[PDB]
Amino acid sequence: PQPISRLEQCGINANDVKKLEEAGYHTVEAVAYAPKKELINIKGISEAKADKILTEAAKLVPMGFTTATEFHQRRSEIIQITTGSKELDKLLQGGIETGSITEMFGEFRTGKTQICHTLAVTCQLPIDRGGGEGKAMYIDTEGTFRPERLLAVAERYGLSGSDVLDNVAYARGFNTDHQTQLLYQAEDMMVESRYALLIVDSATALYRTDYSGRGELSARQMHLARFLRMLLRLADEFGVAVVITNQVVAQVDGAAMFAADPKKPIGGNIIAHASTTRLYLRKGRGETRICKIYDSPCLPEAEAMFAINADGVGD
Amino acid sequence: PQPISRLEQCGINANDVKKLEEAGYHTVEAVAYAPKKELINIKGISEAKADKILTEAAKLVPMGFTTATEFHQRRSEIIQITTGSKELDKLLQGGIETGSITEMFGEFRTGKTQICHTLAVTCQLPIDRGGGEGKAMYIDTEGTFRPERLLAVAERYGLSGSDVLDNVAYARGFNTDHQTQLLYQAEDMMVESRYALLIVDSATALYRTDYSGRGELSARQMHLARFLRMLLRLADEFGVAVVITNQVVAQVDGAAMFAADPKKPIGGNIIAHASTTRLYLRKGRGETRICKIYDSPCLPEAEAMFAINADGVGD
Amino acid sequence: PQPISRLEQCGINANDVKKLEEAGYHTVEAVAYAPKKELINIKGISEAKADKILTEAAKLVPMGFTTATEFHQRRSEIIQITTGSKELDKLLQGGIETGSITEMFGEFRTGKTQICHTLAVTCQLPIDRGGGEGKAMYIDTEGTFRPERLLAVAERYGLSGSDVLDNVAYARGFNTDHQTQLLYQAEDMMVESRYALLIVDSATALYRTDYSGRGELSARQMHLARFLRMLLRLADEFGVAVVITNQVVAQVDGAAMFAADPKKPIGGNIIAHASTTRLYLRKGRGETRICKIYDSPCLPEAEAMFAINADGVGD
DNA sequence: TCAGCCTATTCTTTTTTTTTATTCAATTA
DNA sequence: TAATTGAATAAAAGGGCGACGTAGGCTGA
Ligand SMILES: Nc1ncnc2c1ncn2[C@@H]1O[C@H](COP(=O)(O)OP(=O)(O)NP(=O)(O)O)[C@@H](O)[C@H]1O
Ligand SMILES: Nc1ncnc2c1ncn2[C@@H]1O[C@H](COP(=O)(O)OP(=O)(O)NP(=O)(O)O)[C@@H](O)[C@H]1O
Ligand SMILES: Nc1ncnc2c1ncn2[C@@H]1O[C@H](COP(=O)(O)OP(=O)(O)NP(=O)(O)O)[C@@H](O)[C@H]1O
Ligand SMILES: [Mg+2]
Numbered sequence A, B, C: 001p002q003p004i005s006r007l008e009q010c011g012i013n014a015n016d017v018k019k020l021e022e023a024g025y026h027t028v029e030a031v032a033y034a035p036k037k038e039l040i041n042i043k044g045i046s047e048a049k050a051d052k053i054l055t056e057a058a059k060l061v062p063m064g065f066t067t068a069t070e071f072h073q074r075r076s077e078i079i080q081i082t083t084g085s086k087e088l089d090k091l092l093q094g095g096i097e098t099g100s101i102t103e104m105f106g107e108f109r110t111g112k113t114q115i116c117h118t119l120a121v122t123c124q125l126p127i128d129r130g131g132g133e134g135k136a137m138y139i140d141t142e143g144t145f146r147p148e149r150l151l152a153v154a155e156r157y158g159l160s161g162s163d164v165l166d167n168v169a170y171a172r173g174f175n176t177d178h179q180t181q182l183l184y185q186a187e188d189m190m191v192e193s194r195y196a197l198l199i200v201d202s203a204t205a206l207y208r209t210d211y212s213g214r215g216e217l218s219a220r221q222m223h224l225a226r227f228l229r230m231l232l233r234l235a236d237e238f239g240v241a242v243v244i245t246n247q248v249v250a251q252v253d254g255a256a257m258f259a260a261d262p263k264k265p266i267g268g269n270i271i272a273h274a275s276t277t278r279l280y281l282r283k284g285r286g287e288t289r290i291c292k293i294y295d296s297p298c299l300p301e302a303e304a305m306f307a308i309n310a311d312g313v314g315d
Numbered sequence D: 001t002c003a004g005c006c007t008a009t010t011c012t013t014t015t016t017t018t019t020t021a022t023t024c025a026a027t028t029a
Numbered sequence E: 001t002a003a004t005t006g007a008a009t010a011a012a013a014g015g016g017c018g019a020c021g022t023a024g025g026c027t028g029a
């Protein structure tokens, strides 16, 4: 967590340093690793001083070629905030990945609001219990924010009641353009304090409910690539873990029985380029559920069980 | 629940208040739930005036991140009206909740419309007697409005019939779009008098008879999702309770394995992610039927038992 | 009961108003009962003028939001035709509520084709003796229409059957699509003269023979669903008691018990959800038949003995 | 011409078919 | 003297088994 108070040097004034705050660029990681075509069209920053803010951002955080052994250390330095389920820690090799896109499939009753509200108390746990010891936030868009589920699974982990009440924040995401106004604000709390998890269970559901296909046909598409350009900028900012429940379409293959999958879910191929690690969830018998990793040479294809019981997502 | 009679501040002219009204969004809650580019496509609106509506309405309603010890109270203000027999109410922890989506689905003669008529008398009850002291809004397309039942359950709770008849009102949608034609009625009446409940007793029955051509996103699915976000909108506009009713299909693929008669009710995944909770209907013996809850994030998957008696639901 | 001549105003063209009548829409309620896109799909129509109908269909008939009091005045304004038997009316609490689908399924020889003969006679009475005093319709797809049987009921009620033979009009179906076509001719007759009873006394006897099952079933069921939409709209325009005779299969599994003999009325769910007053017909001893009630919004699960005499239904 | 025709290459590896209701202490003497 | 049940059973295996079609679109036209 680093603000842009470092970026006040080399002839810069106090007026222009606020014009990076009001543009949405609240971190020093936002300045160097952004493409140049979005930074230059702001009214009131000239071309020579725009080349001044990129050259001071180059030497602090390096964009040059770094050793591949440092990348393997960048692969293993993940905190791996565990889901509470030890089978998934044997499936995803020790929990969720902080800073990589981790997508979970779901249609109905598969525990999607139950997995998000067990992880939302996990962010206070120490690193031996798996959690990252940090604040977090659950932004909901389907009107399914639960205090009772949040308060009960804290008793499973044995914490108090009032500390997790000061934990995960919530705002109702009304619109697809309201996904952006929280995102500039969610980086602004990242200036205020450290955060370790961000969860939205129905981010793609707003895409299902704003753009009446077709006629807009690209407007439903580029707003997904927009939203998947913002969150990876926060994922490259600190290394925050992302947890998104994505919905699934029932593909019509129902003649007869050969590879009959009501599948190939929504979001398109442009989330498929961004989802380096995908998961499939589905109903089993009773209330027990099953996870399988998809669309990932990073994680091996296997299956395990996570059981939504009265205590939480456990066994 | 606030109207646009207060937005007429800081240069907003009188033309854009009432043309926003008739076009479909009567409340400033709906303006925050309206998108950016959708406001531009109304004839009589420019792009510069489209900023002056959404930004100035953002001065009215706040959308910041609020901590988890405040929605615990925001859920606690829910009136959570009763269901007429406490075995369902203890299954539902008091009864159905306001500001959510609740669904009853079952085969036939199972009381999909009879659980409506007992909820239709609840809205004029006091808060000690479950009711939010308001009015309910009954919509049905099949023709299951039988107001002699509404005389009956008012005598179940003692109160007179005429004042109840001055209350809850009716509409019958003949078309899929005719639902959204009569949907504007909601807000319209809503701001004139506080309503406790909305009933659409045939959500997807009209959609069952107007498919796309072969199953596709058109009127069968997209206009269904256009419908449900407005049902989401009314849940977020006023917090008014609403019950929804989906018909049921059979399964022709499941040869005589574990259960020879499974159902999987219609609508696919678009209804399912808009679905907050469901309660499955199936008959027992005679007047005894059975409610089984489906897909609640806050309540377990338990089962209860009611009976359609002459006074209404009972035991 | 208002035709397209009540629509021919306001500079609306005379070339499209016959295209409605070519598409079966002979009255302004039907286009008000029709969704927007399908009328746009009609060839040779102006799209805006089609919308100009859709605001003037909204003007001519009440599609506006009303309160249950005037409904309860208008729902009391139903002719409520008696069924010839004294015991059957008090079972149904005053006979057959006009404007509704009342289904009568049973085995062979129970009286399904018998009662539909007697109902066509008792329409011609004045309303004091539970008559309707209107024309009535007979759609047969079995050939079991027998006008000699009507004259026996005519002598029972002191009415000259020669006068009753100038009314009820015969028709005969042969196909699935010859059936649904026969509504569109009949709709006109409903404009040009008052009716009370449109019987389809083997309405689902024909869909079983002309579609196999497990494949070509969805082509049956959707087309069965396309049938009832035209059928419910005939009830609501002209105020006509709609009587459907369903046949019945025998269910074949370990559900074989007594007094249910498990029958499972054919037509799945789409013939079930379109019930207002679903019946059931068992044979007792001899001519004493036993009419159990299913699936009705206002009636209890009772039964009433009735004997099919030499002169119609008797007691 | 489209509409009937033609069946272009594909492509990736693993999940769950019952029950007549006694034990006991009984839920009441 | 309470006495009927709130509770609980399983390794064998049935009076059971069957789906639309727009996707490469030649030739007839
Ligand atoms: N009090 C409770 N006790 C036990 N289990 C519970 C309780 N409340 C909820 N559950 C479980 O929560 C599960 C709900 O799964 P879930 O997939 O989160 O539903 P959902 O996500 O809210 N539906 P949706 O809004 O469409 O995402 C149920 O299957 C229950 O087993
Ligand atoms: N006076 C009454 N006494 C007892 N039961 C009644 C009485 N009136 C109606 N019922 C029952 O109420 C139920 C009404 O049917 P219901 O199941 O609500 O409609 P439904 O599920 O929508 N089927 P459908 O109306 O065709 O779509 C039936 O089970 C009737 O037996
Ligand atoms: N003149 C009569 N006197 C007495 N009973 C009669 C007379 N004519 C017919 N019936 C009875 O009417 C009943 C006809 O049964 P009904 O159920 O109407 O026919 P149905 O079953 O529909 N024929 P089907 O199409 O094969 O089902 C029989 O039980 C006859 O005994
Ligand atoms: Mg869930």
Ligand SMILES: [Mg+2]
Pocket (backbone or CB within 6 Å): B109, B110, B111, B112, B113, B114
């Ligand atoms: Mg019902």
Ligand SMILES: [Mg+2]
Pocket (backbone or CB within 6 Å): C109, C110, C111, C112, C113, C114
């Ligand atoms: Mg008969």
